[PDB]
Amino acid sequence: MKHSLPDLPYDYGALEPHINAQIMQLHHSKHHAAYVNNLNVTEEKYQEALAKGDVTAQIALQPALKFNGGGHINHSIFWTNLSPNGGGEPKGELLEAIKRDFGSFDKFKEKLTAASVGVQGSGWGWLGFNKERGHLQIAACPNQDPLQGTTGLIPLLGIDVWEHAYYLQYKNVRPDYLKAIWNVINWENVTERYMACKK
Amino acid sequence: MKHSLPDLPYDYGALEPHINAQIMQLHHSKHHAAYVNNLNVTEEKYQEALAKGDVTAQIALQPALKFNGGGHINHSIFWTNLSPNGGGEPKGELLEAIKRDFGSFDKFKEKLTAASVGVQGSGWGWLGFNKERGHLQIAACPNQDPLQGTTGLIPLLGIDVWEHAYYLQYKNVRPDYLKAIWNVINWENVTERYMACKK
Amino acid sequence: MKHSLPDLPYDYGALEPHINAQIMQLHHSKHHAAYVNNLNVTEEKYQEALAKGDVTAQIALQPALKFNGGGHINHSIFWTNLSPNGGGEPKGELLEAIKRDFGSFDKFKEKLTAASVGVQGSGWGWLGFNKERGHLQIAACPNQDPLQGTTGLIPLLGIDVWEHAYYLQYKNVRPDYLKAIWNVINWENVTERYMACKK
Amino acid sequence: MKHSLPDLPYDYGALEPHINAQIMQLHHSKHHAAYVNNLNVTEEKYQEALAKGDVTAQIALQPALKFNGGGHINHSIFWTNLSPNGGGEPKGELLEAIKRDFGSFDKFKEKLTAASVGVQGSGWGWLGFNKERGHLQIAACPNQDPLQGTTGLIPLLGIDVWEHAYYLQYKNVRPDYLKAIWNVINWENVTERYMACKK
Numbered sequence: 172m173k174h175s176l177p178d179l180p181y182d183y184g185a186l187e188p189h190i191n192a193q194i195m196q197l198h199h200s201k202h203h204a205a206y207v208n209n210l211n212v213t214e215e216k217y218q219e220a221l222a223k224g225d226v227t228a229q230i231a232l233q234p235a236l237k238f239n240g241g242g243h244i245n246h247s248i249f250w251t252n253l254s255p256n257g258g259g260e261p262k263g264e265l266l267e268a269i270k271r272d273f274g275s276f277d278k279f280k281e282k283l284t285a286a287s288v289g290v291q292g293s294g295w296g297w298l299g300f301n302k303e304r305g306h307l308q309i310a311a312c313p314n315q316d317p318l319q320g321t322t323g324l325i326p327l328l329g330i331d332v333w334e335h336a337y338y339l340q341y342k343n344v345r346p347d348y349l350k351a352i353w354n355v356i357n358w359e360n361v362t363e364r365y366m367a368c369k370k
Numbered sequence: 371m372k373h374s375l376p377d378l379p380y381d382y383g384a385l386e387p388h389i390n391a392q393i394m395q396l397h398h399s400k401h402h403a404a405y406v407n408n409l410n411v412t413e414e415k416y417q418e419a420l421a422k423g424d425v426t427a428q429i430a431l432q433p434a435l436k437f438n439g440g441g442h443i444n445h446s447i448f449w450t451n452l453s454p455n456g457g458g459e460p461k462g463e464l465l466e467a468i469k470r471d472f473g474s475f476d477k478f479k480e481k482l483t484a485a486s487v488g489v490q491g492s493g494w495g496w497l498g499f500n501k502e503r504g505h506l507q508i509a510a511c512p513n514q515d516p517l518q519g520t521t522g523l524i525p526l527l528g529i530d531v532w533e534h535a536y537y538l539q540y541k542n543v544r545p546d547y548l549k550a551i552w553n554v555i556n557w558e559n560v561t562e563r564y565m566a567c568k569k
Numbered sequence: 570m571k572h573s574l575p576d577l578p579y580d581y582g583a584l585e586p587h588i589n590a591q592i593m594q595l596h597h598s599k600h601h602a603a604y605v606n607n608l609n610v611t612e613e614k615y616q617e618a619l620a621k622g623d624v625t626a627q628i629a630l631q632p633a634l635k636f637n638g639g640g641h642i643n644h645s646i647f648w649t650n651l652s653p654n655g656g657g658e659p660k661g662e663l664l665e666a667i668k669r670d671f672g673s674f675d676k677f678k679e680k681l682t683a684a685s686v687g688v689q690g691s692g693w694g695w696l697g698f699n700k701e702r703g704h705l706q707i708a709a710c711p712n713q714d715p716l717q718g719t720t721g722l723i724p725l726l727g728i729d730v731w732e733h734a735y736y737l738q739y740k741n742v743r744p745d746y747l748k749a750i751w752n753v754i755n756w757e758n759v760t761e762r763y764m765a766c767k768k
Numbered sequence: 769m770k771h772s773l774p775d776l777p778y779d780y781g782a783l784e785p786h787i788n789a790q791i792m793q794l795h796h797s798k799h800h801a802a803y804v805n806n807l808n809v810t811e812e813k814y815q816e817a818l819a820k821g822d823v824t825a826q827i828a829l830q831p832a833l834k835f836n837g838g839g840h841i842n843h844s845i846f847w848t849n850l851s852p853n854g855g856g857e858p859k860g861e862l863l864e865a866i867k868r869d870f871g872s873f874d875k876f877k878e879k880l881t882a883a884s885v886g887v888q889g890s891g892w893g894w895l896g897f898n899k900e901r902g903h904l905q906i907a908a909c910p911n912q913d914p915l916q917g918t919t920g921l922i923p924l925l926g927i928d929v930w931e932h933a934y935y936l937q938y939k940n941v942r943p944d945y946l947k948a949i950w951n952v953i954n955w956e957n958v959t960e961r962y963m964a965c966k967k
């Protein structure tokens with residue numbers, strides 16, 4: 172089997188004025204596309220190296236596998252985490268978990284914003300679920316290091332803070348992007364991911 | 371003493387069409403400015419922590435010091451490494467060193483381009499001088515990790531491959547930026563840095 | 570200030586048979602002593618670099634500062650975390666927190682053992698307190714990276730899993746060391762550290 | 769394929785008094801054996817993950833693959849780099865390369881000793897061959913990160929500076945171990961590895 176670029180679940184201009192059409196089109200059709208293709212190339216090289224017992228070759232392929240693999244994992248989640256129907260607050264058990272674990276929805280937003288603003292260089296802020304503790308948890312990841320593969324936490328909501336995710340529109344002012352993105356968070360999707368972790 | 375933002379040695383539009391005016395203005399007046407200011411803040415916090423023997427506080431400040439400090443170091447070099455009078459090939463002893471160490475000027479360009487294109491996420495490609503071996507050396511650095519502070523190599527020529535260095539103009543196509551930047555390399559400056567390493 | 574090697578709170582053979590006297594003597598009088606001495610040297614170099622605005626020099630000193638500084642921080646806590654009168658289970662609010670956060674004392678032991686066994690290369694397992702969440706948390710740290718300086722978690726109980734902490738007695742069998750050390754945990758000290766986090 | 773633990777090319781006590789028999793026996797029959805066994809387990813898990821397109825699982829397996837795989841790579845080279853008939857200086861083209869690249873054999877020894885002493889935590893010092901530059905190069909690697917897999921340099925001579933490589937005999941005094949090991953370097957093997965890089 173081969174990994175493929177998932178279609179975007181909405182039109183490229185559906186998240187304006189929060190994230191512009193040019194960004195969405197580049198981000199999906201150029202950036203994610205590249206990760207998917209380079210992941211498939213890397214996986215094939217890895218299969219050859221594994222079959223030959225070439226451990227040196229396997230290890231040389233790790234950065235490309237984590238980078239492109241992580242890129243595919245993260246952006247596949249990210250597109251579903253956004254929606255033109257998004258924004259506002261979550262409801263039901265996710266909201267209850269947020270209040271219990273972070274005090275309030277606004278305190279939660281502050282913590283995820285702070286983690287996302289705090290990434291030095293390229294990376295991601297995440298709300299995840301800690302299976303072992305049975306509660307929510309915030310973490311930041313560098314580059315395309317994916318949340319579950321590197322920490323064990325199950326991803327619920329990711330915020331891409333690579334410059335490509337915002338620069339054309341917001342330039343250097345990452346906090347303006349982080350303010351805007353709250354308006355398009357697909358809480359339906361984040362709730363679905365959360366409910367799949369429980370039971 | 372306090373670190374300060376060096377003036378750009380040319381006008382913001384001096385490197386068009388290779389690097390556009392909007393990029394130069396943002397990169398110098400917003401990005402580098404931020405690094406300089408946050409470096410001075412970090413250094414003052416470090417001086418307090420040192421005076422108190424607060425080792426925990428010193429260690430907590432390391433990421434900000436490397437990031438903002440490195441940002442200041444790297445961009446201060448980068449502005450002088452470019453010029454509207456740049457491009458072409460170097461001459462004299464630098465050219466002789468390039469031919470001796472890399473075979474030819476074009477082979478050297480291939481290696482520095484490859485290191486620069488190869489940065490996954492944010493970072494820099496460098497031509498440096500290895501004092502101990504007495505020859506040239508190429509290295510890549512992540513984020514704002516500066517060359518001399520992290521490797522001991524003396525920086526001669528740096529290529530910023532953070533998305534902010536090219537994205538407004540070249541979008542995702544980093545190789546187009548790397549082709550363009552060869553036209554504005556200030557070989558006079560790179561030669562001056564090289565000659566200061568010898569003797 | 571000049572950092573100093575804290576006196577051990579018991580004699581070198583007080584933790585026998587669980588950690589032998591030769592290990593305790595080497596670990597305190599050679600390993601920790603070296604961290605203290607090299608920390609003082611590094612801090613003086615940093616003071617000179619700061620006074621000169623030498624950011625390159627500050628950054629070059631970071632590995633020595635984190636390693637020796639972290640070494641001092643970690644081992645100063647570690648000695649107080651152990652006692653000849655230790656072992657068994659904690660009581661009062663710490664025990665209540667352990668049961669609440671990890672299910673039971675035995676489940677907690679399993680998780681901290683697993684984190685400590687899981688360190689590949691040199692490092693530490695920690696029980697810490699997350700100030701922001703107001704609960705207990707287990708984390709692992711590489712090398713001498715200290716818990717609070719690198720994660721913000723307040724250290725309560727640390728387990729050194731550098732080979733020097735066990736190798737003379739247990740050789741490669743780190744799990745035997747981790748089983749043994751439970752017999753000398755100073756729960757009085759861990760409780761004091763925990764109570765200082767609350768209120 | 770199933771990786772296997774290579775036989776040692778001499779008996780466990782053949783490198784006495786420089787590295788004692790207990791160390792060699794533990795290092796080969798326990799440490800390297802564990803890397804081989806855990807590598808085979810990890811490779812099988814990776815084959816399942818690859819067949820399923822489970823990229824998360826592939827990425828979660830990277831630390832075990834690099835650690836155990838790197839451990840296998842590094843120690844397989846290390847055993848052949850030592851010999852009871854070793855020590856003294858190399859001859860022929862390797863000696864000429866050492867003199868050309870480092871000034872002299874004694875200056876080379878100083879640099880490889882310094883790189884090996886300089887490892888903070890667990891790792892290796894290496895003399896390698898840079899294929900691209902066509903000359904010798906010294907590098908250090910953390911943990912079990914292997915030289916060729918992580919840097920592209922071809923390994924010629926490795927020095928293990930994990931505490932398990934010396935602690936039973938030399939305790940904390942790593943420099944005494946590094947002085948001793950020069951007496952058992954198998955220059956015949958290092959020459960064979962060097963000659964395979966050329967032509």
Ligand SMILES: [K+]
Binds near residue numbers: 184186187
């Ligand atoms: K629209």
Ligand SMILES: [K+]
Binds near residue numbers: 189
């Ligand atoms: K907007």
Ligand SMILES: [K+]
Binds near residue numbers: 383384385386
């Ligand atoms: K112009």
Ligand SMILES: [K+]
Binds near residue numbers: 389
């Ligand atoms: K152009």
Ligand SMILES: [Mn+2]
Binds near residue numbers: 202246333335336
């Ligand atoms: Mn992205």
Ligand SMILES: [Mn+2]
Binds near residue numbers: 401532
């Ligand atoms: Mn920049």
Ligand SMILES: [Mn+2]
Binds near residue numbers: 596600644729731733
């Ligand atoms: Mn220790």
Ligand SMILES: [Mn+2]
Binds near residue numbers: 795799843930932933
């Ligand atoms: Mn070893």
